[PDB]
Motif scaffolding. Structure first.
Motif, PDB file in Angstrom:
ATOM      1  N   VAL A   1     -80.285  42.284  19.070  1.00  0.00           N
ATOM      2  CA  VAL A   1     -79.224  41.305  19.112  1.00  0.00           C
ATOM      3  C   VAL A   1     -79.648  40.180  20.026  1.00  0.00           C
ATOM      4  O   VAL A   1     -80.265  40.406  21.066  1.00  0.00           O
ATOM      5  CB  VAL A   1     -77.895  41.962  19.545  1.00  0.00           C
ATOM      6  N   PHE A   2     -79.331  38.960  19.622  1.00  0.00           N
ATOM      7  CA  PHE A   2     -79.640  37.777  20.402  1.00  0.00           C
ATOM      8  C   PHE A   2     -78.383  37.234  21.036  1.00  0.00           C
ATOM      9  O   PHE A   2     -77.343  37.109  20.396  1.00  0.00           O
ATOM     10  CB  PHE A   2     -80.327  36.728  19.512  1.00  0.00           C
ATOM     11  N   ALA A   3     -78.467  36.922  22.312  1.00  0.00           N
ATOM     12  CA  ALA A   3     -77.316  36.381  22.997  1.00  0.00           C
ATOM     13  C   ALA A   3     -77.793  35.297  23.924  1.00  0.00           C
ATOM     14  O   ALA A   3     -78.092  35.533  25.085  1.00  0.00           O
ATOM     15  CB  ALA A   3     -76.577  37.485  23.760  1.00  0.00           C
ATOM     16  N   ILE A   4     -77.877  34.098  23.377  1.00  0.00           N
ATOM     17  CA  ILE A   4     -78.447  32.973  24.083  1.00  0.00           C
ATOM     18  C   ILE A   4     -77.353  31.964  24.393  1.00  0.00           C
ATOM     19  O   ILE A   4     -76.407  31.811  23.622  1.00  0.00           O
ATOM     20  CB  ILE A   4     -79.595  32.388  23.242  1.00  0.00           C
ATOM     21  N   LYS A   5     -77.466  31.315  25.552  1.00  0.00           N
ATOM     22  CA  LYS A   5     -76.468  30.340  25.990  1.00  0.00           C
ATOM     23  C   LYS A   5     -75.077  30.984  26.056  1.00  0.00           C
ATOM     24  O   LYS A   5     -74.918  32.055  26.647  1.00  0.00           O
ATOM     25  CB  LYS A   5     -76.469  29.106  25.082  1.00  0.00           C
ATOM     26  N   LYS A   6     -74.074  30.366  25.434  1.00  0.00           N
ATOM     27  CA  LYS A   6     -72.704  30.830  25.622  1.00  0.00           C
ATOM     28  C   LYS A   6     -72.446  32.206  25.008  1.00  0.00           C
ATOM     29  O   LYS A   6     -71.481  32.885  25.366  1.00  0.00           O
ATOM     30  CB  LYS A   6     -71.696  29.819  25.071  1.00  0.00           C
ATOM     31  N   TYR A   7     -73.314  32.612  24.088  1.00  0.00           N
ATOM     32  CA  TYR A   7     -73.070  33.831  23.325  1.00  0.00           C
ATOM     33  C   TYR A   7     -73.272  35.103  24.135  1.00  0.00           C
ATOM     34  O   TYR A   7     -72.934  36.198  23.678  1.00  0.00           O
ATOM     35  CB  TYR A   7     -73.945  33.876  22.072  1.00  0.00           C
ATOM     36  N   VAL A   8     -73.782  34.977  25.361  1.00  0.00           N
ATOM     37  CA  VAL A   8     -73.821  36.144  26.238  1.00  0.00           C
ATOM     38  C   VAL A   8     -72.413  36.707  26.446  1.00  0.00           C
ATOM     39  O   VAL A   8     -72.255  37.900  26.716  1.00  0.00           O
ATOM     40  CB  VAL A   8     -74.466  35.833  27.611  1.00  0.00           C
TER      41      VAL A   8
ATOM     42  N   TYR B   1     -81.194  49.743  22.336  1.00  0.00           N
ATOM     43  CA  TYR B   1     -80.717  48.378  22.149  1.00  0.00           C
ATOM     44  C   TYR B   1     -81.732  47.416  22.721  1.00  0.00           C
ATOM     45  O   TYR B   1     -82.251  47.640  23.832  1.00  0.00           O
ATOM     46  CB  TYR B   1     -79.451  48.181  22.977  1.00  0.00           C
ATOM     47  N   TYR B   2     -82.026  46.347  21.994  1.00  0.00           N
ATOM     48  CA  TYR B   2     -82.892  45.307  22.507  1.00  0.00           C
ATOM     49  C   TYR B   2     -82.096  44.030  22.553  1.00  0.00           C
ATOM     50  O   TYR B   2     -81.718  43.493  21.501  1.00  0.00           O
ATOM     51  CB  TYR B   2     -84.088  45.149  21.575  1.00  0.00           C
ATOM     52  N   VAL B   3     -81.765  43.580  23.760  1.00  0.00           N
ATOM     53  CA  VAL B   3     -80.926  42.407  23.908  1.00  0.00           C
ATOM     54  C   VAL B   3     -81.804  41.229  24.325  1.00  0.00           C
ATOM     55  O   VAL B   3     -82.400  41.236  25.398  1.00  0.00           O
ATOM     56  CB  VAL B   3     -79.843  42.638  24.957  1.00  0.00           C
ATOM     57  N   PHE B   4     -81.888  40.226  23.463  1.00  0.00           N
ATOM     58  CA  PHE B   4     -82.699  39.039  23.728  1.00  0.00           C
ATOM     59  C   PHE B   4     -81.807  37.955  24.275  1.00  0.00           C
ATOM     60  O   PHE B   4     -80.824  37.572  23.643  1.00  0.00           O
ATOM     61  CB  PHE B   4     -83.366  38.541  22.434  1.00  0.00           C
ATOM     62  N   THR B   5     -82.108  37.478  25.466  1.00  0.00           N
ATOM     63  CA  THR B   5     -81.223  36.523  26.089  1.00  0.00           C
ATOM     64  C   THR B   5     -81.983  35.590  27.002  1.00  0.00           C
ATOM     65  O   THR B   5     -83.070  35.940  27.512  1.00  0.00           O
ATOM     66  CB  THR B   5     -80.097  37.239  26.887  1.00  0.00           C
ATOM     67  N   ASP B   6     -81.430  34.399  27.190  1.00  0.00           N
ATOM     68  CA  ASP B   6     -81.971  33.482  28.184  1.00  0.00           C
ATOM     69  C   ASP B   6     -81.356  33.711  29.564  1.00  0.00           C
ATOM     70  O   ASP B   6     -81.732  33.050  30.532  1.00  0.00           O
ATOM     71  CB  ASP B   6     -81.777  32.014  27.752  1.00  0.00           C
ATOM     72  N   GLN B   7     -80.426  34.656  29.663  1.00  0.00           N
ATOM     73  CA  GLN B   7     -79.709  34.898  30.920  1.00  0.00           C
ATOM     74  C   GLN B   7     -79.613  36.393  31.193  1.00  0.00           C
ATOM     75  O   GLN B   7     -78.554  37.003  31.026  1.00  0.00           O
ATOM     76  CB  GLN B   7     -78.297  34.330  30.842  1.00  0.00           C
ATOM     77  N   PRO B   8     -80.719  37.002  31.605  1.00  0.00           N
ATOM     78  CA  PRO B   8     -80.698  38.453  31.789  1.00  0.00           C
ATOM     79  C   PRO B   8     -79.596  38.910  32.749  1.00  0.00           C
ATOM     80  O   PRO B   8     -79.034  40.000  32.590  1.00  0.00           O
ATOM     81  CB  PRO B   8     -82.080  38.741  32.365  1.00  0.00           C
ATOM     82  N   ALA B   9     -79.276  38.100  33.747  1.00  0.00           N
ATOM     83  CA  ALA B   9     -78.271  38.542  34.710  1.00  0.00           C
ATOM     84  C   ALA B   9     -76.846  38.506  34.154  1.00  0.00           C
ATOM     85  O   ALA B   9     -75.934  39.079  34.753  1.00  0.00           O
ATOM     86  CB  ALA B   9     -78.372  37.746  35.991  1.00  0.00           C
ATOM     87  N   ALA B  10     -76.658  37.849  33.011  1.00  0.00           N
ATOM     88  CA  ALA B  10     -75.334  37.793  32.376  1.00  0.00           C
ATOM     89  C   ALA B  10     -75.093  38.980  31.454  1.00  0.00           C
ATOM     90  O   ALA B  10     -74.003  39.130  30.889  1.00  0.00           O
ATOM     91  CB  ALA B  10     -75.149  36.483  31.611  1.00  0.00           C
ATOM     92  N   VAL B  11     -76.100  39.830  31.290  1.00  0.00           N
ATOM     93  CA  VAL B  11     -75.907  41.011  30.450  1.00  0.00           C
ATOM     94  C   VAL B  11     -74.986  41.970  31.189  1.00  0.00           C
ATOM     95  O   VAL B  11     -75.240  42.323  32.329  1.00  0.00           O
ATOM     96  CB  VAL B  11     -77.235  41.693  30.117  1.00  0.00           C
ATOM     97  N   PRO B  12     -73.895  42.386  30.544  1.00  0.00           N
ATOM     98  CA  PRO B  12     -72.908  43.206  31.250  1.00  0.00           C
ATOM     99  C   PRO B  12     -73.436  44.604  31.489  1.00  0.00           C
ATOM    100  O   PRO B  12     -74.287  45.084  30.744  1.00  0.00           O
ATOM    101  CB  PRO B  12     -71.724  43.243  30.273  1.00  0.00           C
TER     102      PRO B  12
END
Ligand SMILES: O=Cc1ccc(-c2cn([C@@H]3O[C@H](COP(=O)(O)OP(=O)(O)O[C@H]4O[C@H](CO)[C@H](O)[C@H](O)[C@H]4O)[C@@H](O)[C@H]3O)c(=O)[nH]c2=O)s1
Ligand SMILES: O=Cc1ccc(-c2cn([C@@H]3O[C@H](COP(=O)(O)OP(=O)(O)O[C@H]4O[C@H](CO)[C@H](O)[C@H](O)[C@H]4O)[C@@H](O)[C@H]3O)c(=O)[nH]c2=O)s1
Ligand SMILES: [Mn+2]
Ligand SMILES: [Mn+2]
Lengths: 274, 274
Positions: free
Chosen positions: B56-63, B85-96
């Motif tokens: 799953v991708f969660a980039i920018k606001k979609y985190v 789960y593989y979570v792709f994000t530009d904001q690792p610290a926003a991953v809950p």
């Protein structure tokens, strides 16, 4: 990777068949006329240069069935694909001369006059692995009357026995003695598969025939023989190792005993009076 | 090789669903509630120690969507099986911080703020081949509301887009410009598959995502962008490489836009207001 093809669009809200079950509870298709577009399937299997082996035993008097079996196979079985017939017989000279279509060949394997399982799994193991992609194992006292093609091919298939497709599992003639390796309790069973038509990839058919042969040998050592011989063991195997397609009784029929019911849009492979 | 199991006998003359198409013309099951016995499937996949990766991708606001996505995945996605789960994000610290069940793990993969295809096929190729058996690739702006399990697993699957399952192929929003690699003529097409939920074995998903990425790069060099981006290319791929299962719209729904029609016995994976 298929080329452009033009064919009727499937419609999600229009079932192909409403009168019959077309998928098993383990998500294997049940192959009935109307469920498949053979043009799409032919393309998929031709692009893999698929070779199908067909094994048949014709020992003693049953050599008399080979002429009609092979002539009708040439008209209806895997036409357009590579086919290798393997005819096991105690009388190689009684095998009829049948003219084969291009890409099709026949080998006669001489045997001495249930043991089909042993012959398929052990003696021919290496040959089949090198020569064909799928194996189809059938009775010889039969004739093809309509298309039997690559719609059946899959890692492991069994065929619904035509006597039992409408029956509850308690009425299935499984082996019921716990002393036999083929034992199936009254509360188990999905279908009653016919011994006369099964198959799959070479690897899966060799696993099946090895398992059935081993089970038959265990029964023999224990002084017990399953009620319907190899068919009982085939049923035990397919209960424990679910087939990835199930063929409808279009693929294994007896018109003399059972007629031509409305649920059968085609009678493809049928018994010949013995 | 399954153990003894007790469950209701399938009945050949009693279809599971008479209201919908349950098999494609190339004999892939179409997965609807009522068509499968999840106990049998769970056993088959557990006996192979199946591991499912979910990307799953969660980039920018979609985190902001990850909390509900992951919490609901824990309640409904492959429960009982190994999941990564593989979570792709530009904001690792926003991953809950989401508490996971046993046998389940989550990896955060940081990316810079269509290109899901490239990330899946190239950058993560070796990792996925070593870590999971199947990959499932989904949109993040979604929540699980009911069971999504091993009934979906197969070499290659696509999901019917909920806007088009009742539509004729001419109405499908495929790319229609011959200048694009994603071009599909008005007389071609089986289904309109949704970009938000596809998957398969690791090998098949890597083939799909590589092919789509290559096609997207060709379009980019030619100054053209397909009408629905990666979804257009996914549709071209699945037209030419038929999926081995098709998921019904139970698996990709939007209740706000489409309600809860009688044909949907369950709403399993659904859009969240963005
Ligand atoms: O002393 C009389 C004979 C009885 C068979 C013979 C015999 C058999 N066979 C080979 O064997 C095949 C099957 O034979 P049948 O077709 O006579 O019996 P059935 O139709 O009841 O068979 C079912 O039930 C069977 C259970 O074992 C199997 O599971 C089988 O797959 C099931 O379909 C022939 O087609 C032939 O290839 C020979 O080649 N020579 C023979 O002498 S001679
Ligand atoms: O400038 C406004 C933005 C628009 C997306 C953004 C954007 C997107 N995504 C990721 O991308 C996913 C999909 O995005 P949407 O869910 O917004 O759009 P839709 O639902 O119409 O998507 C369908 O159509 C698509 C066609 O390309 C795909 O085929 C897609 O698979 C199809 O389902 C997010 O869930 C997220 O994981 C992000 O992670 N961050 C973002 O900023 S920001
Ligand atoms: Mn017979
Ligand atoms: Mn989305």
């Amino acid at each position: 990777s298929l080329p452009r093809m033009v064919y009727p669009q499937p419609k999600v809200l229009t079932p192909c068949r409403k009168d019959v079950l077309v998928v098993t509870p383990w998500l294997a298709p049940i192959v009935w006329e109307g469920t498949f577009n053979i043009d799409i399937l032919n393309e998929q299997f031709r692009l893999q240069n698929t070779t199908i082996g067909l094994t048949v035993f014709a020992i003693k008097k049953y050599v008399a069935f080979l002429k009609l079996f092979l002539e009708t196979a040439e008209k209806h079985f895997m036409v357009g694909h590579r086919v290798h017939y393997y005819v096991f017989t105690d009388q190689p000279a009684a095998v009829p001369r049948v003219t084969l279509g291009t890409g099709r060949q026949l080998s006669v394997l001489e045997v001495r006059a249930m043991r089909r399982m042993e012959m398929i799994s052990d003696f021919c193991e290496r040959r089949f692995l090198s020569e064909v992609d799928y194996l189809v194992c059938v009775d010889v006292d039969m004739e093809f009357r309509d298309h039997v093609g690559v719609e059946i091919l899959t890692p492991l298939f069994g065929t619904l026995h035509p006597g039992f497709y409408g029956s509850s599992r308690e009425a299935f003639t499984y082996e019921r003695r716990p002393q036999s390796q083929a034992y199936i309790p009254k509360d188990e069973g999905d279908f009653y598969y016919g011994g006369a038509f099964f198959g799959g990839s070479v690897q899966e058919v060799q696993r099946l025939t090895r398992a059935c042969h081993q089970a038959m040998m265990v029964d023999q050592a224990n002084g017990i023989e399953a009620v319907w011989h190899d068919e009982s063991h085939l049923n035990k195997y397919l209960l424990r190792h679910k087939p990835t397609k199930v063929l409808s009784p279009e693929y294994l029929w007896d018109q003399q005993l059972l007629g031509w019911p409305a649920v059968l849009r085609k009678l493809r492979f049928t018994a010949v009076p013995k």
